[PDB]
Subunit: 165 residues, 10 copies
């Protein structure tokens, strides 16, 4: 069963945003365009260029009315530490959702069951809750924020201009 | 339960390639970089720019040693007809897999159950059979062949030089 | 679990008829004599004379108040293309039902499970929805349209005047 | 889930042929073209001309190597009685299979559940056991034996000349 | 579980009563004494003297208010043919129930499952529906109508007079 | 499921045979024709002429090679007391099987579950163990030993001569 | 999981008392001291002196307000016959409960499964239904009726004088 | 499921006997006449005369070759303390089985489920392990030891000479 | 599945306290700081220093408003006997709960199933009924009443001033 | 069911020790005294005095032949970061096991299912694998390493001197 064109499942998670800690539910995504940016773990040796690339477009994303949610199986406490410790993660102004239970990760069928870590996946969600775009890659393959931005612009176009030759 | 980083399931399908009918199995994808390009239906009123953009990069894809498989729920007979009817589909030099059973579409968890059509999804499969990249979009949202090309080059780099960075 | 003398199961399909796309449900068959003509696939190398025969008798079938529905597992978009391509399929004035899900095909128990195509079967359905005649043949064995007319006329005579046989 | 292009299921039924009782199994259909002619019941008020029209073409069917099997939910004892006191059934040279259990009838998905009787169905079976043609009609609609004869000749043609379309 | 002293199950079968086709249900047996006479098949080489012996006592059975039902897995069309073909079966004025489904046969647990035929059984049913007497015999062993008549006379005596010392 | 034309189930019961206590099993019935005569209880106010009628034909039954077994839910101790108390039961020379467990009664599906007594049933068993004739009657209706004798004579004829036209 | 100090389960059995058949339920034991005397079978070769010794003390038991119930897996018809043709059973003034189903026997966990007979057990039941004394013996070991009489008198003493130890 | 005339279930318990701790299993009861004397608890306000009676007849019981086992849900450590405390319990020369698990108590179906104590029950067990006599009484009703001796002597007579009663 | 930070299950037990028998329920622990001190058995040869050490701090525990409940699988009758027999157990001013059913022991998941005795475990329960501290040791390893006292003072501090540090 | 006096369940976890990363299985605890020190999460605002107290006794623990395993649901990457970031955690010379799957945490029945974090528990394990001491506290209640040290010394004494008055 594909997760495309389906409504997102309810959740309640603690997150880090700009300093300090906030709580995010599925109620917060209502009437808003949402991006769920899943990544394995904090403090890994892999370059955090994927997250920093989104941070560079975040001002343009907020202009388009798009909320960004970076999610991992690490705690929100770890997100705060990684925000202060890493050079690139300091640019992150959007929410960094901690998912220690993995309930939100499992809502998007994105758990490495044997590792206990999220897969490298990105979800574009419309105001209705329906998933419009899915993008999953393996370890080492980078996700372009420019192509993500292009996809959102195309998704917002279909919503306003439904059905055309 | 995620489809990423898993070996592809065996299949047996009929396809259309450059005026000839050929049978493609999972054996044909072995030892080869493969791209499974799923799309809804033939002869629709939607612009065929998604499949045409892949055709433009196909020579560059064959240069990297990558096979391209365009798959839909239509028959391979329909693919031959669509290759002769449309101006953009005439450029398609790669294989056009016909999947009437939907078995190949079900293998990649990419079936619109109540429509009987494949979703707009792209899969990048390494020579071992493991899926490295998944890209799914809803009807209307276009897929970029240039970003697909970038991902394959990035996937081949990690396959060649693993453990480096950063 | 014999299919004969049972009411037809509800359906919702897209169809092509005279340069127009229409939606056909089980409601459209109500109060009318219907004929469901199933066939494998569009754009095949097999001679399309079976559909051509029904086209020749269609004027006579409409005269008896009988609706003809040609059903295939192909999309309704594919049917339009086939109407413009073949000389024999151009003669088709009746509706060409597209059944990508195979829901309507499985309703009449007529799906080639491992092939994903409809079998060569013809169904005669009365105004009530009850199936009166079933004719299934393998690939190659032709279906006679003039014998179908004989069967429909006989079915209409039994409906009008019950208990008038020996 | 359709019954077309599938091998026939094994059966063991008693039959009546030319004044003698014989037992027929799936082994008897092996290597032979077989036609299974199903009908509701014996001693019905409806014309037995459907079976009689097959009996007229039976000479031609035997020359083609086609065996005819008339199947009913009645006993083989009943078939003997219907053979004796009927003008049209007296012409039957082929076997009249009795199916009191309804096992053979259910093999072809041809049972009226509420009536306990077979439906008006004709099946064309090749030497391998694979079903090539199915014809099912309701009470009143007659089955054409000369059209059945045409179908068998067409089924034999594709068997000897495989995939000969169109040209 | 025993079939004796239990109410008969509902049924709807077509039958042949001297020249005419009728339909018999569990409703027809109500308020009346009933005898269900099961037998293998019509047009068998075995002697039909079982049904002929019941036919001789049938006039006395109607005087006692007892309805007789002859049941087999053959159709009611076959019962008519057997009536006007055999001299012994021609004496039958009682109803000949046809049971092609075997629903009535299975109600009395009397079906030869591998043969699709009824066993040689006789059931005596009172106005209430309760079975009072059961007699089952194997193929070849005959049943006596004179003994059956005696058993019904005794059953009607017990029904009218409760307790006998 | 019908009890007719099936092999009898194994049993081990104590019995009373004219003056002495014996034990009867399924082994004793083998190679011999057997008649199992079931009845409610000993010392009842109902007429014991059912068992007395069988006792009169018992000498002829032994000439035919038929063993008679009278079974009830009473103990074998009770059968002895009933033998030397009633003039009709005193005529019994055949075995009187006591079945306090009801195991043998349940083998023939003949137990009145709420009463704990046997129904009025008679079973005819051949040397192989196969039941050939069943006769069950409700409380009050009598069984005839003369008809029973006739049924055994017919059963032995069919066993020796297969197929009768 | 022991049966001591538990209320007796409901029952409906036929009994024999002084030439007349009566029906006894759990309602009849209400507000009355009850003794359930179980034994294997009627017409056994073993002495019926166990029942006879209870019959001798029955006059004293009735004065204390104690009802005696003799239970057997035999029918109430059998109890009448054993009452008529026995010297010791003729002295029985109390009820002789028949338990052909074994339902009452199973209520006291006193059934020999392989024999279908009750075991040699005696139960002392108070007006509330609560079991106060259980005595089960094997075939051969006699049950003392005068000791049973002592137990009932002791059971009545703790009922009227609750928790009077030692002093 | 009557407990009478059934073999005793295996057990492994610690016991106190004559200033010594010993382990008693079902093996120790084999080939010997055994008596299992169950009682609620140690150090109760209830008069310990029931155990005192068995102590007085113990010499006579050992003369008949009968072993006496007094079982309680208390520990074997508690039994030692009770042997030193009470004047009546000091007379106990037989083994006092401690059953904290209640395994041996549940074997004889003698557990007060909601109280966690053994009921007042006496069991006579033959050399084979078969239970011959069961006597259960409620709190307050005394158990007679002299009537127990009568029951054991009767049980031994039946074992020696079967079928010698009327 | 951990027992920590959960509300205690209801119980009804008989206990011995200062020469008197009293019934203790979960109602008695309400609004009160409670310590459930589990131990194997009475009258053992193991040094009773664990229970004696708690008795030394009992006056200091009552000063903090803490109730102490010593629990074992033995009867409350045995506790009275052990209070009079032992020199160290004579100091016990707190309640000694008798748990013959083992129901209270099962509530705290602290039963040696094959021994029928409680394990060496200490539980600290706040006025709300929530367990704040669990300490379990195998036979032989001693429990410190001073560290227990430290934990209760630390538990009362967090209850008073939550959210502070560091 | 209590976890006291039971053998530890098999596991395979990645850990941080002294720099750098190692893998620990149940095979590594064989023939050695082990301490499993569970704690909720890394980078929390709670003072890490519990872990630092054990670090002060670690030299004495290694003298007694005791291995210390600090476990949390955080990754081993996070453990390395927290080792470098925190003043007290820099003293940690023993292994810091990362348990993102929570499999090792669930082996000791120590998971806060709704939080996805380990409870505050300490386990003393002998060379055989058998758990000798369990110590669980709530948030805010400190665990004394001196009392832990005393318990281990007592546990090692019982192993060498088994059974005494």
């Amino acid at each position: 069963m594909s997760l495309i064109n389906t409504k997102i499942k309810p959740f309640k998670n603690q997150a880090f945003k700009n300093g300090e800690f906030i709580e995010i539910t599925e109620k917060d995504t209502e009437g808003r365009w949402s991006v769920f940016f899943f990544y394995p773990a904090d403090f890994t040796f892999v370059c955090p260029t994927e997250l920093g690339d989104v941070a560079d477009h975040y001002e343009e994303l907020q202009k388009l009315g798009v909320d960004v949610y970076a999610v991992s199986t690490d705690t929100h406490f770890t997100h705060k530490a990684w925000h202060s410790s890493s050079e690139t993660i300091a640019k992150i102004k959007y929410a960094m959702i901690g998912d220690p239970t993995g309930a939100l990760t499992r809502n998007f069928d994105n758990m490495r069951e044997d590792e206990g870590l999220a897969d490298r996946a990105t979800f574009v969600v419309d105001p209705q809750g329906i998933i419009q775009a899915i993008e999953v890659t393996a370890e080492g393959i980078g996700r372009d924020a420019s192509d993500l931005l292009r996809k959102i612009k195309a998704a917002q176009y279909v919503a306003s201009h439904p059905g055309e030759v």
